[PDB]
Design a protein around this ligand. Structure first.
Ligand code: NH4
Ligand code: NH4
Lengths: 166, 166, 166, 166, 166, 166, 166, 166, 166, 166
């Protein structure tokens, strides 16, 4: 499992409510507690529930010094389109990376080779670029965005309190 | 060059103004004069001029027993989205295939490995599934949709008039 | 990721409060909603919280037609020993599989090659033997046993309600 | 596809109405807008229409700072012979390269391995030696020489007007 | 056979009645006459006879400047557990190494690949880290702990009396 | 050397003063004494002396039941062209094969890889399709067409008079 | 380790006080409890103690339905010689196999590649041809012939009393 | 074909009417127009006509600054023997190389693998050690020694008169 | 060593005072006691002593039902020539095989790769085609022809008197 | 053949009537005329005739500055045993090397892979460590010890009298 491994090098276009398109690299994921969530496709049939539940928790997550990135094999262009032409996804303030080359979906071992889409997986990365938590559910079973603040806290506690885990 | 070669096997989701999403295979390209045009990405910055110029010519092309397929590595979901949330692309009546697996873009050797997007290429396929014409321009140089009806006619003439090409 | 894949063939000794040691195979995960949780080592320094939290939820999980299996690369012998010589782990009523061969830990891609121990991963398997949910946290970050009943329900819902996921 | 790639190194004999035979290299395709057109064989049965159509457009193309090269796997000797012993091809003023080694036809991936002849392909190359347009038709389907001035212009426009393509 | 070969590099956790867990390397086996005994599993059904018989002989073995190490693929945690929750094994004063990685069991070619357990093998190593005696019996056939003092003596004699073996 | 070997399979277009273009195979080489002569290129600068000298001897050679084939990597089209637009080569009555695929020049190991042209080689083949004589001179050194009637005679004599060669 | 493996096929000459030279195969090892002991070389400097100690125990071992074989890479000729020209080895009544081909020494992985001699190893084989016990000591450390009757008994007990090993 | 290639390195014993045996290397071929003729075997049944015809032309060839070498896989010993015990071959004044190693016959690709003899081949080498002419006839068809002076002249003319070959 | 191996298949031309040239196969070497002697080269500087000494012993060897074959990589042609143009070798009545292909010299492992000549080796072959004696001396050390009658007798004796060799 | 090759490196134990066991290397074979004779096995059934006939010739051989070495894959221990417990072999005064590793028998290409014994081969080595004579007979055909003095003489003569071999 990628648990405990370090994020591999990548470069991709992203969109964020506010700033116009900008590049992103393995670097941005280093130096801060980043949490990236993957999802099938933009403009999909399934309701963007997962994505916005995260938006709600975003306010708080930022306080904990955490950054949030959503990823799908769609182009950053459609991410913007989706963001505008939809109230739900329009409330998202965090970063939306586009992975049309499939490279970053593939590196997190979450790309479904035959559909060309990513799986519902969420990763939590420590300031060192190391994966500390992995959650991948099948289409239908939802990811509870609330349990995130707990995990990142727990992750951060153990970060400067080794062995004190009981 | 793929000129004169036979279309390779593929299976993909498509969208068409009217019918709700449906599957498509190498078969669909066999039995009729089909002309498929590839393009970078949906919701892109470049104006969908190419796509709709083809829509104009669509009326007549259908009379000649020709079918038209647009292809991009976008999901059929976004194709629909784009089709609705845009007047220009909304006039498109022909088939819109989605190639997120990249397989069909790759088989026509028109996939840009590093960007994960297709090139501006247009192919004309005879009822046997053989490529009779190839046109690939760089971003900026436009593809003239009018010269299409001429090519397909020429292609069809030669089809049952071998050697009579002067 | 193993999400959506089918559980691989395995044969191992298990212990369960009540029945004396018995064998278990891939088939015992087929036909029923099974949820297997992996952990580092028995008699470890870290408190068996995770394991017992699941014991609490066990009552209800059984109602839902779900079976629970704990796994570590320890021998079933030590699982029993631990079970007896400890009040905490002694409350566990579900199955305790022993994976000294490391085969099953390896098949779920959760075995740490160099330490010879398993990672904190929990999987949810549908009656067909397919993995529908994966959660792997690092030492320290705890797995919330409560969010299990929700996932299994969600999993069960979509089971006989395809596409109805909004 | 070779779209966007750089012309490969080659050295060949050429003939041009006026100057007596002279050598040519990839260097002659750099610094200037060059457009090279491939054809089956000299003295072939099919009428040299395509070649001369281009002759007509030659006048103007030169104004745009564009050079024209015709290529076939024939020797430059026969190019000259053809040029003299035929009124039609005799009107040609642009360069006629001979590719008996098949190397340049092969490098543009336009050589038909088993017949040893080139396909009807036309390429447009920017002053940097990069392919910006590709058009390959089957025997019978003609290449419209007129749409060339448009393509080169469009190519030239985008050359110093990046992104301005709408 | 490993007879006459040098002990390979390894690092593992060990437990010893008295000192709390400590690391051990191939270095602890050089410099002194060490005798390591492997066994299936802790808390096993078979009576720990073998292990304790060696405990008896331990008193004298120490006099001869010999150290004793017991090894099983169990974790040092369970070694301690076993040591406490059992009168028999509780009499053991020598070192108890844990080989969950299986690396040291594998290096002495005594690991049963399919069961993930070690074979009943006892090795005698001279102060140079070279194996001078090997004894591996099947489950059931016991290893006579008494014949140890004789072998180490014999080994020690020949150590400083080459060829004098008659 | 190919001396004594059997002519390999080939299919090519040929031209002959009189008959309009026709196909030729390694089989047209079996059943009769055939003599094939290779040359650089048609319409070349070097005077077609060699080719016509053979034309002179052709009258007689036919009496001996010998057939003559000229070969160059040129297309049969240009062979015809050359034959008409030149008095010298116009006197040629024997077969003129075209080898634009280079396959037959390559099979007689007489093709100059880098120039894509054939060497000045003349071969004599017995009714069985076996090479009995090989003569390859460099550009400049001429092949004496007269010494051919003697070689074919000698060849034919030995044909039905084994060992009688003194 | 070869523990639990089956004896590999071999054919060799043997000598036994009484019967004149005779052949031996793996087959002789099957159907009876056989115990084979390897040793360096005949007429060696080291006293044949080991071999004769076994002779003493031979009387009893035969009662237990056990056969004994001594093996060295010497020829059966010298085994005979040694047996005659020496009082000590002359008391030996069991079989003396000769392994000059080194194949049987090699098969029991007891052959010292560079000296071409066997190591001091003793194996116990059940009636099925499977190795149940292995003892290999270095030159100097002696093998206790007495502990043999115990091992074979234990081996035989467990033979028809599986699991009853406590 | 070896036409235009450079003679490969070799060292062999030779005999020449007058000088007693002496060595020969590639070098002797360099700096002068050398013409080497291969033949089956010395003392063969076929009359040495070919060899002596060359002897006749030798007088003049020397005037042209040409050297002549005969080669067969025979030893230089038998070349001398043949030279003496035969009037015909005794008239030979040029060099007679012996190729029992077969290396030089093999390098000129003129060695018949199965018979171990050379083919009737004659080569003309320019002062640079490059092959300018090749003639290989089958047993029976004779090589005309007269046409040699013409070829060497032609070869020499073109040597200092490039392109002037018409 | 080839001692005891069977003569491998070969076919070669031979010469024998009396019969004109004839073929020979590994078949001739069976059914009779044959003794083949190899030597460097015919017409060599070293005196044919060895060959003729064997001729002297020929008379008697024939009585013993033995045939004699001389072999050198020379052609059977030169063997005859040498036989006639020399009193010494002219006395030879036995078979003289020629091995220009080097195959038979090579099969007896007596061919000197770099000189292309055979070594001074003599072999004795039983009627079954098996090598029973091998003698190879360096240039200078002579082979004693007299010791042959003894060897073949000894060979013949043991042939029908197994083990009676003392 | 190893004729003319140089003895390869080896190190072995030897025994000689008088001196107690001592080492020997490819060194002892240089600097003097050494003659090594191989034989099957010590204490063999065949009478040691060959070995002692050499003993008789030993006296003289030493005069010629020749040393004698007997070799068998037996251990030097058995060589001594044989030497004492047998009148015949007891007369041997030359060196008796033991080759249990089979390396020296193997280097002289005289080891019978399947029996693990050497062939009856005798080699004569010049002071440079080069093999000058090879004689290998089958079991039964004897090696004549007398012909040795002649060979070494002949060998020595040619040693300082090159070419004088007639
Ligand atoms: N960063
Ligand atoms: N030279």
């Amino acid at each position: 499992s990628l648990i405990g491994t370090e994020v591999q090098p990548f470069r991709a276009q992203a969109f964020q409510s506010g700033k116009d398109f900008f590049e992103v690299t393995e670097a941005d994921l280093k130096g801060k507690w980043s949490i990236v969530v993957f999802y099938p496709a933009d403009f999909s049939f399934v309701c963007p529930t997962e994505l916005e539940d995260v938006q709600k928790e975003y306010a708080e997550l930022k306080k904990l010094g955490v950054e949030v990135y959503s990823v799908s094999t769609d182009t950053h262009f459609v991410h913007k389109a989706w963001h505008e032409n939809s109230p739900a996804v329009g409330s998202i303030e965090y970063i939306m990376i586009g992975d049309p080359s499939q490279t970053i979906s593939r590196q997190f071992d979450v790309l479904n080779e035959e559909t060309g889409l990513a799986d519902r997986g969420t990763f939590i990365i420590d300031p060192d670029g190391v994966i500390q938590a992995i959650e991948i559910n099948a289409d239908g079973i939802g990811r509870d965005a609330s349990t995130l603040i707990n995990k990142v806290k727990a992750a951060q506690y153990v970060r400067e309190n080794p062995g004190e885990v009981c």
